[PDB]
């Protein structure tokens, strides 16, 4: 079980020079109560997003580099990094999925393509790094073996690998009858995990699909389609999903709230669905609305096990399509899967995003920002962070609008922002 | 009464393979409580508009195309679509009224014109589609009969018709003595329903008019002029109106709040007047402030039986007047009936709206968006939607300002929005 | 720090036969929230006594006999039992003080007597069990040594002893100038600890006395005379007391509330003064209003380190004075120190109490009742109990009057109560 700020502070005073105190409170230790708990924070029933609150700083007794980012993707899959690339056709094909797996996250390949194309993109990921090449003890390396996989293994210390030392790959499927043929090809191609990709996952079509998959492929991991209430999470956990995607109407390319009136503010949705799903041991993906490393840290602190990004990974070099320069700045398209670009009504807008270079120079920046966020909180790992949140030890503070203005840049005439140097 | 999400989910699990549970709860089923009810939502006494809240998603066991939109306009008139065109001189004359009646709603012809002109515009609507042409068993189709009316029937399966197979038409009148002569001509022209068109309907002039109409034309339907409180709704329901228009100071061309200090935020007004009016079996029109299909779904979920649009139908081809290209885009004028364009003080601003093409290519888009909004809620019809709201099954969530920013488009460089493809 | 119910339950499931769960919550474990915390309980600002609330049951993974009752009397004195006999002339002289010291608590000898008499009663306690009799390695047991003290050791394994193997004794003094000579005699007699014994301890007279004692006898332990607010506790902790007595106007012989309007309900007083005093490492004595072993457990759970009894120890055989049979039942007198039996106004009533036999057959009953109360809470010690209270793990429930009626004996015709059999 996790150690409280007072316990750590006492052990560190005790390692050094600088009875009734133990007998009185028995190692709980007086700390002045300040801020709110997640429970109090969300009792008000305002609709909070990530911008509406702050996390209060804690006690530091470690450096940032030693923060453990190990996360559950599902009941059975673990990642060394909490980051996931979204199953969108402007975000995740084999190159993005390979890159995310190498940096210790995972990518879900999109399904706005033919079944044979998606299965080939999955096979490209599973082929990229190899133990024994059986279709040309594994300790014999230092069927075929090649030193290039030892170089990959050296160069990428966090890489998400299966038992055969191949990269992990996810894929999307819908809830239509012809998705049964996709899933046959994807399970032949060696896919590790599935997302069912509904905008609203609490449906007979999705529940029938979850029961069909758990019957035909009982070793396959399945993640529930998008939910934002505990009542939706109940029926998918009772259908036997191994994880959930959380978020509806948030996400930068989205218009579903203004078209359909359904959705939820993403902070409350992540907190409420995670606080329900933990009772059954089910991990949460927080999906959409992630603009900054502070949104990743907030999503994780509210109980998300992993964070899924669309826009923040769009216009990296590994994202699908090509750059086009049109506005006098280097731009790549980013479309939304319910745009009419991707009666039928649009659920999303098709747009464009400025260039960010490679995933491999940008994900270690998100990792470093998550570690430094966890260090100022006093969390030695992400499991310790969620543990402190559920126990009340972690404190929160609501923001007014003037407070959010004050949390940005003020009356400078001009400024330059450089986020990271190397 | 309607069936609950747990009842529907249980029947669906029961149609298939996948005792104490029934004996304990009597089939109610456990659903984790999440969100607010309309009652809790409006207990806070903040002034909520449609932008200030969301509807939480439900349980889906049907496709969107089978959502029933049948609505009550008054105690005795039913429409197959909840949409009404507003009685403004830049919105509703015979062409708009014909188009709305044909797509399954109704139009109220404006009164900023002579009594003889308004009666001629009403007669143009009542003539457009005919059964027995008596002024050149009806199943004789397959005293004159024309096949063009059979074609009209074939092409418009939701047309709002009277017993004689003619389109429904509404008209406006004021509460002056000379409005008694208008109403003689309009009832000779065959008008089906009246609106009394006040800014503030709770007046002796209006109550005297409602009593005069119900005395002279006892078969005529009358809709009360604008109200925003239950105390105003009481005196008009007691005078014997068959419906109410709800909204004061909202509506895109309006300035009444800044000029007069009177009004109400339209969400609260629709909820509070509809909650009162249902006790007497009186339908509500939600009038003004409708910018999106999500505003229509929200207005209907709060208890409105029908929704009346000005701006959203302005600059369609059937809207009065001509296009004029002035700002480098095709524009039509949209004036507000208390603008000085239409001491005398302005209640509204005269302005301009961009072209949208025909009502007949734009109303099936609003219908499709209402159906998809009701599908994500779990409502098989609009009646079921309002039933779930009054019974607490439907849940709501308030939005902060950062939450409404998150419900729009985020840090895209640029975006294109196409609302519908066909 | 203490281990939580979820942590203990998980280790006990783990010792036996009957991953994402650890990665999600960091071992905190889901437990459904129920009841109130001490903080919430006292936020209401009602005046709660011990009868107004209950402690909610926890998780058991130990037997009662292994509950540790070790307690702090002051910053430097520890007792193996949390029970103290009150400094009243119908309760504590040498025989009661010897008996309490032998069963593992302590007695404070009363000051309603000459200084020489009080010093002789203190000397009688310090003489009773001896190590080296120097006024006729100590491992020499197996300058005089007697086997009777070895037998005393054998028979009383919880006796409160000093370094010289003598029983601990406390004494009372007032805050008058003539108490300076009294305290010189008590420190010659070998007293271990002092109580300053006031109705209202927050006075210049008591603060001047605390400063005088800490100057002249810097190794002597001093407990501050009675307080019921954090503002009173501040000035005595700042004067340098080593403990506080908490309670004003409670206590069975008391009338101070009806005479003076001052006091506090004893539950709130114990909670609020203990919550303040823990910030400085100062133990609390809960003083008066103890009628049942459940009052002792409640006082200790609210943050009291020890509990002081008057009435519950009155009319034991070791209590001062002689028995009488005036009402057919066997009785002793029990007087209150501000009664006029003990213009001047009474603060207390002089009365009578029924016989209970010896301290040595009645204190092991209070010990067994405290252990069984801590077992149902799931507290392995009193330190762990207070730790669970300050950390929110321990839950409370308020009682209505009908609830208190239901917590007693109901519609029986008659009943017999035997509290303990051996
Ligand atoms: N998370 C969001 O906020 C959000 C919102 C809108 C769209 N999207 C994305 O856009 C894409 C499309 O989402 P979607 O929800 O429109 O796809 P969808 O296929 O789940 O839903 C489209 C329609 O088809 C229906 N449907 C689904 N399976 C069916 C079946 N077997 N039989 C009959 N009807 C069936 C649905 O109920 C719905 O009316 C996905 O990539 C999704 O992630 C996401
Ligand atoms: N819903 C709104 O928020 C809103 C606000 C302002 C105007 N409007 C619209 O503008 C138009 C004008 O509305 P209006 O209310 O100003 O017109 P109105 O003629 O009803 O009211 C104008 C004034 O005349 C008075 N009046 C009405 N009947 C009278 C009678 N018989 N004898 C004496 N005085 C009488 C009214 O009390 C008011 O002082 C309408 O189309 C209306 O729908 C709407
Ligand atoms: N805890 C209670 O609820 C409570 C209430 C009343 C009495 N008592 C008990 O009864 C006994 C008497 O208590 P008490 O408070 O009346 O005794 P006390 O001597 O402390 O107070 C009596 C009066 O003398 C004053 N006084 C004290 N020291 C003084 C000094 N040096 N110079 C001048 N004035 C001084 C006090 O302020 C008060 O007015 C004690 O045993 C006490 O514990 C307890
Ligand atoms: N040789 C080989 N490599 C494979 C195959 N499938 C996957 N790989 C991967 O290909 C990667 C590249 O290895 P290299 O050492 O660069 O192979 P190479 O030098 O290009 O081999 P040549 O094609 O013979 O020139 C390794 O990480 C292998 O795991 C396969 O069928 N054959
Ligand atoms: N042939 C081959 N050997 C590998 C590969 N990955 C790891 N190994 C070897 O198998 C052993 C695995 O230990 P690690 O490399 O520490 O852990 P890992 O999880 O397998 O891989 P990394 O996450 O890349 O460190 C080492 O001897 C590796 O060199 C791979 O892709 N191909
Ligand atoms: N013929 C006729 N049609 C009417 C009259 N009043 C309304 N209508 C409508 O006119 C519509 C058009 O019918 P068409 O078949 O196009 O009539 P048409 O071919 O223009 O008739 P002609 O004028 O003889 O050329 C039908 O939907 C009728 O309901 C009327 O007095 N006479
Ligand atoms: N001459 C004529 N016959 C009609 C008209 N509308 C309906 N009918 C006929 O009268 C019957 C009505 O059929 P329906 O279409 O099912 O009922 P409806 O609601 O009036 O019309 P729809 O909206 O088209 O469904 C049918 O026998 C039609 O042929 C009309 O406008 N003109
Ligand atoms: N011998 C002795 N024992 C003392 C003295 N003060 C206290 N005691 C206690 O008295 C007890 C000794 O009891 P006994 O051995 O029976 O001595 P006694 O009570 O004097 O009985 P007799 O010797 O028979 O008169 C021990 O517990 C001592 O601690 C003292 O001055 N002398
Ligand atoms: N002569 C004498 N020896 C004692 C006395 N009390 C303890 N001792 C001795 O000193 C040691 C105390 O051991 P313990 O009995 O375990 O601990 P304690 O706190 O002193 O006393 P207990 O409560 O009996 O445990 C032992 O070696 C005893 O023999 C006493 O009262 N008189
Ligand atoms: O058309 C759409 N409408 C609504 N949400 C979408 C659509 N397409 C994708 N999404 C969601 O948007 C998320 C990306 O959000 P972003 O990272 O903030 O840009 C994805 O992971 C999907 O869950
Ligand atoms: O001059 C005016 N001032 C205030 N409200 C008006 C005026 N003229 C019309 N309205 C209202 O505005 C509604 C249209 O609102 P809109 O659809 O949001 O533009 C109409 O249906 C009337 O109820
Ligand atoms: O005369 C008095 N008036 C008020 N309180 C008293 C008086 N004498 C003693 N006390 C307090 O009463 C406590 C005993 O309470 P009891 O055990 O409930 O009877 C003592 O420990 C004192 O703190």
Swiss-Prot record, chains A, B, C:
Pathway as given in its UniProt record: Purine metabolism; XMP biosynthesis via de novo pathway; XMP from IMP: step 1/1
Tell me which Gene3D superfamilies the record gives: Aldolase class I
Return the InterPro entries for the record. Answer: Aldolase_TIM, CBS_dom, IMP_DH, IMP_DH/GMP_Rdtase_CS, IMP_DH_GMPRt
Q: What is this protein called?
A: Inosine-5'-monophosphate dehydrogenase 1
Q: What class of enzyme is it?
A: oxidoreductase
Q: Which organism is it from?
A: Homo sapiens
Per the entry, which co-factors are needed? K(+)
> Where on the chain is Omega-N-methylarginine found, per UniProt?
264, 278
Effect recorded for residue 142 to K: In LCA11; does not alter the enzymatic affinity of the corresponding enzyme; alters the affinity and/or the specificity of single-stranded nucleic acid
Q: How does it assemble?
A: Homotetramer.
Keyword terms of this UniProt record:
CBS domain, Cytoplasm, Disease variant, DNA-binding, GMP biosynthesis, Leber congenital amaurosis, Metal-binding, Methylation, NAD, Nucleus, Oxidoreductase, Phosphoprotein, Potassium, Purine biosynthesis, Repeat, Retinitis pigmentosa, RNA-binding
Tell where it localizes. Answer: Cytoplasm; Nucleus
Mention any additional remark: Because IMPDH activity is tightly linked with cell proliferation, it has been recognized as a target for cancer and viral chemotherapy and as a target for immunosuppressive drugs. The activities of the antitumor drug tiazofurin, the antiviral drug ribavirin, and the immunosuppressive drugs mizoribine and mycophenolic acid (MPA) are attributed to the inhibition of IMPDH. In addition, bacterial and parasitic IMPDH's differ significantly from mammalian enzymes, which makes it a suitable target for anti-infective drugs.
Report any one BP term from Gene Ontology.
'de novo' XMP biosynthetic process
